Amino acid sequence: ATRHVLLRQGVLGIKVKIMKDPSRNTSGPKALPDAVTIIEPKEEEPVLEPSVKDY
Amino acid sequence: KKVYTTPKKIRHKHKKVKLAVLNYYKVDDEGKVAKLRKECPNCGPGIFLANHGDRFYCGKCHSTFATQK
RNA sequence: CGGCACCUUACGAGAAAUCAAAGUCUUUGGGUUCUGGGGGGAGUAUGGUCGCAAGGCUGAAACUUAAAGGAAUUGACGGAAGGGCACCACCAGGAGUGGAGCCUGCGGCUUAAUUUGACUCAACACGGGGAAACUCACCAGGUCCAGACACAAUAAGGAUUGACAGAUUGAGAGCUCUUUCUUGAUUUUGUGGGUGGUGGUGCAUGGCCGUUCUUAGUUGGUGGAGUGAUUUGUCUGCUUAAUUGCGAUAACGAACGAGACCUUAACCUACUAAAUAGGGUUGCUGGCACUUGCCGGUUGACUCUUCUUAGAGGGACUAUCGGUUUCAAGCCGAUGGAAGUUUGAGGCAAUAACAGGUCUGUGAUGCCCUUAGACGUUCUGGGCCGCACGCGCGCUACACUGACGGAGCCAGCGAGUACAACCUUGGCCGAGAGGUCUGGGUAAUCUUGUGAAACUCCGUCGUGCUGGGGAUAGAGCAUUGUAAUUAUUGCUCUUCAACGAGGAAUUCCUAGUAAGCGCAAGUCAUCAGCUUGCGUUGAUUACGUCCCUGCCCUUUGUACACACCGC
Numbered sequence: 294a295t296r297h298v299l300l301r302q303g304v305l306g307i308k309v310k311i312m313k314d315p316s317r318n319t320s321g322p323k324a325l326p327d328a329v330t331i332i333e334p335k336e337e338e339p340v341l342e343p344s345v346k347d348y
Numbered sequence: 349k350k351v352y353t354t355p356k357k358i359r360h361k362h363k364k365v366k367l368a369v370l371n372y373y374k375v376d377d378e379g380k381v382a383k384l385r386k387e388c389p390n391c392g393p394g395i396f397l398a399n400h401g402d403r404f405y406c407g408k409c410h411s412t413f414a415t416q417k
Numbered sequence: 418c419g420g421c422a423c424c425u426u427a428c429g430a431g432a433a434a435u436c437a438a439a440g441u442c443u444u445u446g447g448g449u450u451c452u453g454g455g456g457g458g459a460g461u462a463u464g465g466u467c468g469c470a471a472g473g474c475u476g477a478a479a480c481u482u483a484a485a486g487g488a489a490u491u492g493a494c495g496g497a498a499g500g501g502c503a504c505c506a507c508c509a510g511g512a513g514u515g516g517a518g519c520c521u522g523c524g525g526c527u528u529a530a531u532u533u534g535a536c537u538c539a540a541c542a543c544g545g546g547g548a549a550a551c552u553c554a555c556c557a558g559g560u561c562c563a564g565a566c567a568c569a570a571u572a573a574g575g576a577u578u579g580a581c582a583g584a585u586u587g588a589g590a591g592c593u594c595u596u597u598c599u600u601g602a603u604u605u606u607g608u609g610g611g612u613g614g615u616g617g618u619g620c621a622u623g624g625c626c627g628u629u630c631u632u633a634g635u636u637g638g639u640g641g642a643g644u645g646a647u648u649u650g651u652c653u654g655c656u657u658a659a660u661u662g663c664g665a666u667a668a669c670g671a672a673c674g675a676g677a678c679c680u681u682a683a684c685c686u687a688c689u690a691a692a693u694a695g696g697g698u699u700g701c702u703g704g705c706a707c708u709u710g711c712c713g714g715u716u717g718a719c720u721c722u723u724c725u726u727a728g729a730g731g732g733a734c735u736a737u738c739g740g741u742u743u744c745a746a747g748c749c750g751a752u753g754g755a756a757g758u759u760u761g762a763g764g765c766a767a768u769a770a771c772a773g774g775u776c777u778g779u780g781a782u783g784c785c786c787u788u789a790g791a792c793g794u795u796c797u798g799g800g801c802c803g804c805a806c807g808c809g810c811g812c813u814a815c816a817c818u819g820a821c822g823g824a825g826c827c828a829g830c831g832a833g834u835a836c837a838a839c840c841u842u843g844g845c846c847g848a849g850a851g852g853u854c855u856g857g858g859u860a861a862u863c864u865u866g867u868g869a870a871a872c873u874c875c876g877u878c879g880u881g882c883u884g885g886g887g888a889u890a891g892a893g894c895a896u897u898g899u900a901a902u903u904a905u906u907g908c909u910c911u912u913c914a915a916c917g918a919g920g921a922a923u924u925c926c927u928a929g930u931a932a933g934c935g936c937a938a939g940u941c942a943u944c945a946g947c948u949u950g951c952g953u954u955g956a957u958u959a960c961g962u963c964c965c966u967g968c969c970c971u972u973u974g975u976a977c978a979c980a981c982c983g984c
């Protein structure tokens with residue numbers, strides 16, 4: 294957002310950049326293109342006998 | 349910048365030589381009226397001809413006569 | 418035991434460089450001599466004294482001045498030293514430019530006026546600046562108020578508005594002086610007060626742009642080093658296009674910049690699709706050979722999506738293998754693969770800036786100027802285009818890898834009108850240019866397969882300033898416009914100039930590039946030698962280096978900090 298401001302002495306040039314957060318952008322991507330968030334893995338118990346569970 | 353030229357002769361818009369209660373028209377009796385010069389043929393009466401040496405015109409139609417009177 | 422000599426912490430010091438003394442000093446006192454008290458004036462004047470002298474020792478003030486110094490810190494810079502990077506650097510090469518003619522910019526001169534802005538890269542085919550008027554700012558001349566608003570002088574016995582006729586006037590400018598008719602309180606005459614200005618100042622500003630730099634640079638949070646400015650992180654090395662990474666490490670983890678990203682250029686017999694994209698069978702239908710077969714033409718039918726488009730996806734990640742490299746980052750070579758140069762090309766693009774440009778894009782604007790015979794506007798005629806002559810982009814050629822004729826004959830970006838006059842096929846006229854009638858198109862439909870050139874084939878001239886080369890020239894025929902002379906441009910005939918590959922110099926370039934070739938829109942009523950794109954033809958030589966040039970860092974030195982155009 295640019296906007297000139299006229300005053301008695303002269304002009305003042307106002308510029309404003311607002312970097313909106315990715316999560317609240319909606320249109321387009323919801324995250325930055327370089328960021329790679331990896332999900333946390335889930336634990337499992339090995340072995341515990343061969344076993345079966347029938348129906 | 350370059351200097352202004354200065355010949356000298358200036359020409360102003362003419363003030364017009366305004367005149368009212370002009371000596372056109374007359375009355376002799378009192379009751380009736382006696383028109384001087386003549387009224388316009390093209391437009392209605394009330395407007396009056398301009399009189400010169402065999403040359404006429406009127407101002408409501410800017411200037412549009414030719415025939416004498 | 419003795420003199421001519423390193424490292425860490427300093428708790429001891431020190432303004433700090435540093436110092437094992439320059440320590441045991443505001444926790445102030447071991448014993449002594451000598452010297453200094455802002456800088457300059459000045460080691461001068463004077464006197465003494467010492468000398469053969471030159472000079473020495475001794476030693477002022479008046480007056481002057483706000484700094485003089487020291488140490489270091491960051492910079493900037495250096496005809497210091499190392500290490501990087503780049504075809505805006507060079508090699509190895511190509512194409513060149515610089516010469517020739519001509520276009521066009523810019524000087525210089527000229528001129529009423531040949532308007533102005535900008536001069537190393539980062540001024541000079543730039544101002545989208547190819548000016549016939551307009552544009553336009555300049556000149557010669559004329560016109561016009563577009564003098565908002567406030568307040569008085571006329572206030573209708575007119576305020577001021579108009580005004581055919583010819584002289585007037587460049588001139589069917591009422592521009593006015595000849596005129597004597599209109600016009601009705603708008604105005605208008607002043608005084609406050611605005612308004613406009615391609616007037617000024619870009620070294621008063623905004624915004625935008627250019628440039629340092631598209632280079633690889635920039636930052637802060639802790640933590641450590643310093644009293645401190647600061648510094649380290651941000652670095653020996655090796656990598657990378659990149660502060661790209663790997664590593665080594667009072668630094669750890671981060672952000673910006675780069676990368677990622679985006680757009681486009683490439684692949685899809687795998688999807689979704691089409692008589693505004695293309696094919697297949699078949700109908701009718703033209704010609705052939707004449708057997709069934711070959712080329713066609715028709716939006717007659719039916720069906721398809723390979724090419725087309727363009728939606729959704731995948732696909733490349735340096736993949737697999739080999740070496741090479743502390744067996745790291747990576748790099749080098751083969752294999753496959755549409756693609757293995759960051760896959761190609763761009764779009765964006767940090768911190769800090771520059772007194773870079775633009776107040777002639779701007780109702781972006783400060784202040785100054787100007788401000789009703791304007792530097793406002795507006796008409797009219799010119800001028801930006803003039804020529805002893807410099808440089809700068811450019812085009813055309815110096816021919817035989819050609820020229821000229823025929824013939825063959827293939828692109829991609831585009832663009833294109835209804836209130837205007839756009840592209841304009843198809844038919845007739847014209848040697849041409851160009852005219853005409855008619856269409857089709859508001860556009861994958863029509864122009865348009867834009868059957869563009871350079872190319873390819875067969876013939877004519879053969880290495881002679883020749884048919885190379887086409888300049889200057891004269892004439893006519895066309896068109897655009899109100900206006901073409903200071904040829905607008907096109908065409909027709911005629912004239913045939915310079916120039917046999919261009920010295921010193923210097924530009925551009927690493928692959929579908931270079932160079933050639935044309936098209937294309939942009940500006941545009943009319944004008945392409947310009948420009949942004951496009952495709953067509955398509956190489957030579959590297960695939961390295963710091964020799965030059967520039968730039969970057971590091972270490973160094975600095976009386977510089979308005980920073981070498983310095984002091």
Ligand SMILES: [Mg+2]
Pocket residue numbers: none
């Ligand atoms: Mg004047």
Ligand SMILES: [Mg+2]
Pocket residue numbers: none
């Ligand atoms: Mg003193």
Ligand SMILES: [Mg+2]
Pocket residue numbers: 505538
């Ligand atoms: Mg440069």
Ligand SMILES: [Mg+2]
Pocket residue numbers: none
């Ligand atoms: Mg010119």
Ligand SMILES: [Mg+2]
Pocket residue numbers: 542810
């Ligand atoms: Mg150019």
Ligand SMILES: [Mg+2]
Pocket residue numbers: none
């Ligand atoms: Mg012209």
Ligand SMILES: [Mg+2]
Pocket residue numbers: none
């Ligand atoms: Mg203006």
Ligand SMILES: [Mg+2]
Pocket residue numbers: none
């Ligand atoms: Mg102005």
Ligand SMILES: [Mg+2]
Pocket residue numbers: 619
């Ligand atoms: Mg400036």
Ligand SMILES: [Mg+2]
Pocket residue numbers: none
């Ligand atoms: Mg300047």
Ligand SMILES: [Mg+2]
Pocket residue numbers: none
């Ligand atoms: Mg700190």
Ligand SMILES: [Mg+2]
Pocket residue numbers: 651
């Ligand atoms: Mg640093």
Ligand SMILES: [Mg+2]
Pocket residue numbers: none
């Ligand atoms: Mg390997």
Ligand SMILES: [Mg+2]
Pocket residue numbers: none
């Ligand atoms: Mg790329």
Ligand SMILES: [Mg+2]
Pocket residue numbers: 865
């Ligand atoms: Mg078409």
Ligand SMILES: [Mg+2]
Pocket residue numbers: none
């Ligand atoms: Mg000849």
